[PDB]
Amino acid sequence: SVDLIGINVAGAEFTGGKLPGKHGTHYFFPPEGYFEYWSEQGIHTVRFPLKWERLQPSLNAELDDVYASLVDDMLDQAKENDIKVILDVHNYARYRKKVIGTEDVPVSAYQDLMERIAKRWQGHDALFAYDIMNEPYGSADKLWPAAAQAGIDGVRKYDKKRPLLIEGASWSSAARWPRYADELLKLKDPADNMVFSAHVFIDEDASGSYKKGPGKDFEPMIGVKRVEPFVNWLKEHGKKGHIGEFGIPNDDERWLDAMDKLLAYLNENCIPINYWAAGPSWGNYKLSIEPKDGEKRPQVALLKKYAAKDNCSDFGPAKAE
């Protein structure tokens, strides 16, 4: 049903300055055999970033044959290896650097993209859900709620079953969620399968760059404290939630303890998580959980412990009763 433990598989969105770019040089899809390792580890849900400009080089027009076919291939391999996939439009509420809702990118063009994504892949067994837009921020924040409704309407023309994952303003910050999220209360899903998805990192600025270590004033509950504003908003408003991104470096055991406390809190509240990140071409990336010679991935052992716990019947938090 709904797996509480999942991973991001990043690479198809890399090198945004090269459009269309070349597969194998600027961007990377999973090679053959890739999902076998993760299925063997007991991870069965993947969030998969995609670049809007590569999927649709022209607004309101057919999806790109080559790039969309690489998505086809990836979903085929996920199905072969018992993996369910959340497709993520990894675009910050922008197309070619212009905000959805401006003159150059009308909401109707965003609706068109989501229609074409759902039309092409709603019949694919490996597709689990649609994360309609990664991290709206900045000048896109005010227009994002209107764009979100258009994206919902686009998907629902072709897929009236699967969950829709709706991110929030300000990089979908979990910690700042209640500051801005009341504007999302007007969103409507006729299929009643809408889930809000927030992001959290536990470095000082919560950006995930980890410019410093935990420090002397480290609190093991830092992750819990940063998702509480989000989860409490969900409870107050009877909404369902999800954590689309969280990751830590592999070089300090204190980060692992905070990750453990966060996973325990999310488990108690039936909130799934997608670790950021695995992927076929991360190299030395400090948050990567992809196997690499000479690198230990203690985050994976922790995820595996939680992946064996019972899933919940649906996205939490549970309704008050």
Short mmCIF file of C-alpha atoms in Angstrom, two decimals:
data_model
loop_
_atom_site.label_atom_id
_atom_site.label_comp_id
_atom_site.label_asym_id
_atom_site.label_seq_id
_atom_site.Cartn_x
_atom_site.Cartn_y
_atom_site.Cartn_z
CA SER A 1 0.00 0.00 0.00
CA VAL A 2 1.90 3.00 1.38
CA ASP A 3 5.53 2.32 2.31
CA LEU A 4 6.84 4.39 5.21
CA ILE A 5 10.47 4.07 4.02
CA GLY A 6 11.65 5.14 0.57
CA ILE A 7 14.56 6.79 -1.24
CA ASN A 8 15.13 9.47 -3.84
CA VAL A 9 16.89 8.28 -7.00
CA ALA A 10 18.38 11.44 -8.48
CA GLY A 11 20.26 12.05 -11.72
CA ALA A 12 17.72 12.70 -14.47
CA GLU A 13 17.54 16.36 -13.40
CA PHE A 14 21.29 17.05 -13.22
CA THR A 15 23.09 19.83 -15.11
CA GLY A 16 20.11 22.11 -15.67
CA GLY A 17 22.19 24.43 -17.86
CA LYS A 18 22.35 21.83 -20.65
CA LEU A 19 18.99 21.54 -22.42
CA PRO A 20 18.21 19.09 -23.89
CA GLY A 21 21.61 17.82 -22.74
CA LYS A 22 23.12 14.40 -23.37
CA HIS A 23 22.21 11.29 -21.38
CA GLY A 24 25.37 9.82 -19.86
CA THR A 25 27.16 13.19 -19.81
CA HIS A 26 24.85 15.83 -18.31
CA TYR A 27 22.10 13.64 -16.81
CA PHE A 28 21.78 10.02 -15.77
CA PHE A 29 19.00 7.43 -15.58
CA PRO A 30 19.43 4.17 -13.62
CA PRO A 31 21.43 1.59 -15.58
CA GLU A 32 20.28 -2.00 -15.86
CA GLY A 33 20.54 -3.84 -12.56
CA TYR A 34 20.25 -0.61 -10.56
CA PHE A 35 16.98 -1.34 -8.75
CA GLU A 36 18.06 -4.89 -7.87
CA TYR A 37 20.37 -3.62 -5.12
CA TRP A 38 17.70 -1.46 -3.50
CA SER A 39 14.98 -4.12 -3.72
CA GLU A 40 17.45 -6.56 -2.15
CA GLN A 41 17.93 -4.02 0.67
CA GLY A 42 14.17 -4.03 1.30
CA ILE A 43 13.45 -0.55 -0.11
CA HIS A 44 10.37 -0.60 -2.34
CA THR A 45 9.43 3.07 -2.94
CA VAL A 46 11.48 5.54 -4.98
CA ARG A 47 10.98 9.26 -5.64
CA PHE A 48 12.34 10.09 -9.10
CA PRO A 49 13.19 13.69 -10.08
CA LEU A 50 12.52 14.77 -13.68
CA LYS A 51 13.38 18.02 -15.48
CA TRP A 52 10.36 19.78 -17.01
CA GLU A 53 12.46 21.39 -19.76
CA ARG A 54 13.74 17.97 -20.88
CA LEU A 55 10.29 16.37 -20.71
CA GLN A 56 8.66 19.26 -22.60
CA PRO A 57 11.08 21.41 -24.62
CA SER A 58 8.09 23.51 -25.75
CA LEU A 59 5.09 24.43 -23.61
CA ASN A 60 1.69 22.99 -24.56
CA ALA A 61 3.25 20.38 -26.85
CA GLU A 62 3.99 16.66 -26.96
CA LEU A 63 6.50 15.23 -24.49
CA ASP A 64 10.03 14.65 -25.78
CA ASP A 65 10.34 11.19 -27.32
CA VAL A 66 13.87 10.45 -26.10
CA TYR A 67 13.65 11.76 -22.53
CA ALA A 68 10.14 10.44 -21.91
CA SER A 69 11.22 7.04 -23.26
CA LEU A 70 14.05 6.97 -20.73
CA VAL A 71 11.35 7.45 -18.09
CA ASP A 72 9.45 4.55 -19.69
CA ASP A 73 12.54 2.35 -19.38
CA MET A 74 13.07 3.34 -15.75
CA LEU A 75 9.48 2.50 -14.79
CA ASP A 76 9.82 -0.84 -16.60
CA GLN A 77 12.91 -1.70 -14.55
CA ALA A 78 11.25 -0.59 -11.31
CA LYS A 79 8.35 -2.95 -12.04
CA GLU A 80 10.75 -5.83 -12.70
CA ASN A 81 12.35 -5.25 -9.28
CA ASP A 82 9.29 -4.68 -7.05
CA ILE A 83 9.76 -0.89 -6.87
CA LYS A 84 6.96 1.71 -6.84
CA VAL A 85 7.83 5.15 -8.21
CA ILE A 86 6.79 8.69 -7.30
CA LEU A 87 7.42 10.90 -10.34
CA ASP A 88 8.70 14.33 -9.26
CA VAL A 89 8.58 17.42 -11.50
CA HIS A 90 11.79 18.86 -10.10
CA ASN A 91 11.37 22.46 -11.18
CA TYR A 92 10.88 24.93 -8.28
CA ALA A 93 7.59 26.18 -9.81
CA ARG A 94 9.51 27.53 -12.81
CA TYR A 95 9.91 26.74 -16.52
CA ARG A 96 13.06 28.12 -18.13
CA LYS A 97 13.50 30.32 -15.02
CA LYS A 98 10.01 31.89 -15.26
CA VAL A 99 7.40 31.37 -12.53
CA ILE A 100 4.19 29.44 -13.25
CA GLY A 101 1.47 32.08 -13.46
CA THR A 102 3.50 34.74 -15.25
CA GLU A 103 2.81 35.69 -18.87
CA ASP A 104 5.51 33.39 -20.27
CA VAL A 105 4.33 30.36 -18.26
CA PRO A 106 0.54 30.43 -17.78
CA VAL A 107 -1.07 28.01 -15.35
CA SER A 108 -2.72 26.37 -18.36
CA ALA A 109 0.73 25.30 -19.60
CA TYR A 110 1.50 23.68 -16.25
CA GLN A 111 -1.90 21.97 -16.35
CA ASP A 112 -1.01 20.73 -19.84
CA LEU A 113 2.25 19.19 -18.60
CA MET A 114 0.50 17.34 -15.79
CA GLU A 115 -2.19 16.10 -18.20
CA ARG A 116 0.51 14.66 -20.47
CA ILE A 117 2.41 13.02 -17.59
CA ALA A 118 -0.71 11.31 -16.26
CA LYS A 119 -1.91 10.36 -19.75
CA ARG A 120 1.39 8.65 -20.59
CA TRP A 121 2.08 6.84 -17.31
CA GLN A 122 -1.25 6.25 -15.53
CA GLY A 123 -1.30 2.78 -17.08
CA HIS A 124 2.14 1.86 -15.74
CA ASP A 125 1.98 -0.56 -12.82
CA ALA A 126 5.20 0.79 -11.26
CA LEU A 127 3.83 4.34 -10.98
CA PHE A 128 2.76 5.06 -7.38
CA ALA A 129 2.05 8.80 -7.15
CA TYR A 130 2.78 12.22 -8.64
CA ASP A 131 4.88 14.80 -6.77
CA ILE A 132 3.60 17.64 -8.91
CA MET A 133 6.37 20.18 -8.20
CA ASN A 134 9.62 20.24 -6.22
CA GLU A 135 10.28 23.13 -3.82
CA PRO A 136 8.41 26.26 -4.95
CA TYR A 137 10.36 29.22 -3.59
CA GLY A 138 10.85 32.95 -3.70
CA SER A 139 8.87 34.82 -6.32
CA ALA A 140 6.91 31.63 -7.07
CA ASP A 141 5.47 31.40 -3.53
CA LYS A 142 2.50 33.73 -3.95
CA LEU A 143 1.36 32.17 -7.24
CA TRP A 144 2.05 28.58 -6.20
CA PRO A 145 -1.40 27.74 -4.70
CA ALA A 146 -3.10 28.67 -7.98
CA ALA A 147 -0.54 26.66 -9.96
CA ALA A 148 -1.00 23.68 -7.62
CA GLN A 149 -4.73 23.56 -8.33
CA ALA A 150 -4.06 23.57 -12.07
CA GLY A 151 -1.62 20.69 -11.67
CA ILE A 152 -4.16 18.73 -9.64
CA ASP A 153 -6.76 19.38 -12.35
CA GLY A 154 -4.31 18.23 -15.01
CA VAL A 155 -3.52 14.90 -13.37
CA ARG A 156 -7.15 14.19 -12.47
CA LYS A 157 -8.26 14.40 -16.10
CA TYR A 158 -6.43 11.09 -16.67
CA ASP A 159 -5.68 9.52 -13.26
CA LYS A 160 -8.49 9.57 -10.69
CA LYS A 161 -6.89 7.05 -8.30
CA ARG A 162 -3.26 7.76 -7.44
CA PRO A 163 -2.10 10.06 -4.63
CA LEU A 164 -1.07 13.60 -5.50
CA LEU A 165 1.86 14.95 -3.48
CA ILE A 166 1.58 18.72 -3.02
CA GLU A 167 4.64 20.64 -1.89
CA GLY A 168 4.56 23.99 -0.11
CA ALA A 169 6.12 27.41 -0.46
CA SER A 170 9.60 28.30 0.82
CA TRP A 171 11.29 25.14 -0.51
CA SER A 172 8.45 23.10 1.04
CA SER A 173 10.08 23.70 4.42
CA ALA A 174 8.59 21.53 7.13
CA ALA A 175 9.90 23.85 9.85
CA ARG A 176 8.32 26.97 8.34
CA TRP A 177 5.22 25.13 7.05
CA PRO A 178 2.49 26.86 9.14
CA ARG A 179 3.80 30.32 8.21
CA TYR A 180 2.49 29.92 4.66
CA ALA A 181 0.46 26.71 4.35
CA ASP A 182 -2.98 28.17 5.12
CA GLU A 183 -3.04 29.29 1.47
CA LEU A 184 -3.11 25.59 0.51
CA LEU A 185 -6.38 24.95 2.37
CA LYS A 186 -8.36 26.09 -0.69
CA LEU A 187 -6.92 23.24 -2.77
CA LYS A 188 -9.49 20.63 -3.81
CA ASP A 189 -8.97 17.08 -5.10
CA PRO A 190 -12.14 15.41 -6.45
CA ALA A 191 -10.56 11.98 -5.85
CA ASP A 192 -9.76 12.75 -2.18
CA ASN A 193 -6.21 11.44 -2.49
CA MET A 194 -4.12 14.54 -1.85
CA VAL A 195 -1.02 14.48 0.37
CA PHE A 196 1.18 17.38 1.43
CA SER A 197 4.91 16.73 1.20
CA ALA A 198 7.48 18.74 3.14
CA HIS A 199 11.28 18.69 3.15
CA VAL A 200 13.69 18.78 6.08
CA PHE A 201 17.45 18.79 6.65
CA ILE A 202 19.12 19.15 10.03
CA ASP A 203 22.09 21.40 9.25
CA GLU A 204 22.05 24.93 10.66
CA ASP A 205 20.06 26.56 7.84
CA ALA A 206 18.11 23.37 6.97
CA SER A 207 19.30 23.61 3.35
CA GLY A 208 21.12 20.27 3.29
CA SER A 209 24.54 21.74 2.51
CA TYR A 210 25.94 20.71 5.95
CA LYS A 211 28.54 23.49 6.05
CA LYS A 212 29.24 22.60 9.71
CA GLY A 213 29.16 19.52 11.89
CA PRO A 214 26.56 18.96 14.61
CA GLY A 215 28.49 21.23 16.98
CA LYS A 216 28.69 21.30 20.76
CA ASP A 217 25.05 22.43 21.16
CA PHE A 218 23.58 19.57 19.14
CA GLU A 219 20.08 18.36 20.02
CA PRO A 220 19.18 14.78 19.02
CA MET A 221 15.54 15.82 18.53
CA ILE A 222 16.42 18.51 15.95
CA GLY A 223 14.73 16.57 13.14
CA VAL A 224 11.57 15.97 15.17
CA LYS A 225 11.48 19.64 16.19
CA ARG A 226 11.66 20.70 12.53
CA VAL A 227 8.83 18.44 11.30
CA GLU A 228 6.50 19.07 14.28
CA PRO A 229 5.16 22.37 12.80
CA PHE A 230 4.22 20.46 9.64
CA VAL A 231 2.69 17.42 11.36
CA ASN A 232 0.76 19.58 13.85
CA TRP A 233 -0.68 21.62 10.96
CA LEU A 234 -1.79 18.38 9.30
CA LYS A 235 -3.52 17.32 12.52
CA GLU A 236 -5.16 20.72 13.03
CA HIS A 237 -6.59 20.71 9.50
CA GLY A 238 -7.30 17.00 8.95
CA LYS A 239 -4.74 16.64 6.16
CA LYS A 240 -2.31 13.89 5.12
CA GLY A 241 1.45 14.26 4.96
CA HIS A 242 4.75 12.98 3.65
CA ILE A 243 8.44 13.93 3.89
CA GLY A 244 9.83 14.04 0.36
CA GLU A 245 13.46 14.79 1.23
CA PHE A 246 15.74 14.25 4.22
CA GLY A 247 19.43 13.35 4.29
CA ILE A 248 22.54 13.47 6.47
CA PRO A 249 26.30 13.06 6.04
CA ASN A 250 27.96 9.74 6.86
CA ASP A 251 30.77 11.21 9.00
CA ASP A 252 29.21 11.86 12.44
CA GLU A 253 27.23 9.39 14.54
CA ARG A 254 25.23 12.27 16.04
CA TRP A 255 23.47 12.79 12.70
CA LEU A 256 22.41 9.13 12.71
CA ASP A 257 20.89 9.45 16.18
CA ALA A 258 18.83 12.46 15.06
CA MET A 259 17.75 10.51 11.97
CA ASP A 260 16.67 7.62 14.21
CA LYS A 261 14.57 9.96 16.38
CA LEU A 262 13.00 11.51 13.28
CA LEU A 263 12.14 8.11 11.77
CA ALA A 264 10.53 7.05 15.05
CA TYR A 265 8.33 10.17 15.13
CA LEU A 266 7.34 9.78 11.47
CA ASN A 267 6.53 6.11 12.05
CA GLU A 268 4.31 6.91 15.03
CA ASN A 269 2.44 9.41 12.82
CA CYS A 270 2.29 7.24 9.66
CA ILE A 271 4.23 9.84 7.65
CA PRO A 272 6.35 8.23 4.88
CA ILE A 273 9.85 9.49 4.09
CA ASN A 274 12.03 9.59 0.98
CA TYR A 275 15.72 9.77 1.84
CA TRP A 276 17.79 12.27 -0.16
CA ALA A 277 19.46 10.71 -1.96
CA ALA A 278 20.50 7.62 -3.86
CA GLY A 279 21.32 7.71 -7.55
CA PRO A 280 23.46 6.33 -10.37
CA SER A 281 25.92 9.24 -10.67
CA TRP A 282 26.40 11.04 -7.36
CA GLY A 283 30.14 10.52 -6.94
CA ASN A 284 31.46 12.06 -3.72
CA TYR A 285 28.12 13.69 -2.77
CA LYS A 286 28.08 13.86 1.03
CA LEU A 287 24.41 12.83 1.42
CA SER A 288 24.55 9.95 -1.06
CA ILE A 289 23.50 6.49 0.10
CA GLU A 290 24.52 4.89 -3.18
CA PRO A 291 27.21 2.22 -2.72
CA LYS A 292 30.69 3.61 -3.29
CA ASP A 293 34.13 2.09 -2.74
CA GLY A 294 35.57 3.22 0.57
CA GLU A 295 32.32 4.84 1.75
CA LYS A 296 30.12 3.50 4.53
CA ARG A 297 26.38 4.21 4.35
CA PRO A 298 25.13 3.83 7.94
CA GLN A 299 21.93 5.61 6.87
CA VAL A 300 20.96 2.50 4.88
CA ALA A 301 21.18 0.14 7.87
CA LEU A 302 18.92 2.51 9.79
CA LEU A 303 16.40 2.75 6.94
CA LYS A 304 16.39 -1.05 6.69
CA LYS A 305 15.43 -1.38 10.36
CA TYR A 306 12.41 0.87 9.83
CA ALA A 307 11.48 -0.63 6.45
CA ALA A 308 10.66 -3.87 8.30
CA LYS A 309 8.07 -2.19 10.53
CA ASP A 310 4.43 -2.50 9.51
CA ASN A 311 3.19 0.08 7.07
CA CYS A 312 0.09 2.10 7.84
CA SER A 313 -3.10 1.72 5.86
CA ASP A 314 -2.87 5.24 4.40
CA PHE A 315 -0.87 8.45 4.65
CA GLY A 316 -1.02 9.77 8.20
CA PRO A 317 -1.37 11.39 10.61
CA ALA A 318 -4.34 9.40 11.86
CA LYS A 319 -7.56 11.34 12.24
CA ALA A 320 -8.57 12.31 15.75
CA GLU A 321 -11.27 9.99 17.09
#
